[PDB]
């Protein structure tokens, strides 16, 4: 199997390639909330992605698919 760390927690997947949205739903996050989806790869700067984009967990160096609240407006 192939594993992807979502928001700091590693989740195992039965497919070599998993859609962002699917991995996001596996972690308990809402894909249709407003998020800034980013993927990390060792030796590479973080790259912004789409909720429906598909990732390949076989990609070497894959670190974490982390989301950051798109709107941060609390006082």
């Amino acid at each position: 199997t192939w594993k992807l760390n979502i928001q700091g927690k590693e989740f195992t997947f039965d497919t070599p390639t998993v859609v962002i949205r699917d991995a996001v739903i596996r972690a308990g996050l809402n894909p249709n909330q407003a998020w800034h989806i980013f993927l990390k790869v060792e030796g590479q700067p973080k790259v912004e992605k789409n909720i429906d984009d598909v990732i390949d967990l076989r990609t070497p160096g894959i670190e974490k698919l982390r989301l950051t609240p798109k709107d941060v407006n609390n006082g």
Partner: peptide, 24 residues
Amino acid sequence: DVGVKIPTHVDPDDGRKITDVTGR
């Protein structure tokens, strides 16, 4: 302009979990 946010989600196994602690 300054803003903060502590989003939260219900993790499938652990339960309610902080999603992020962020500032702008």
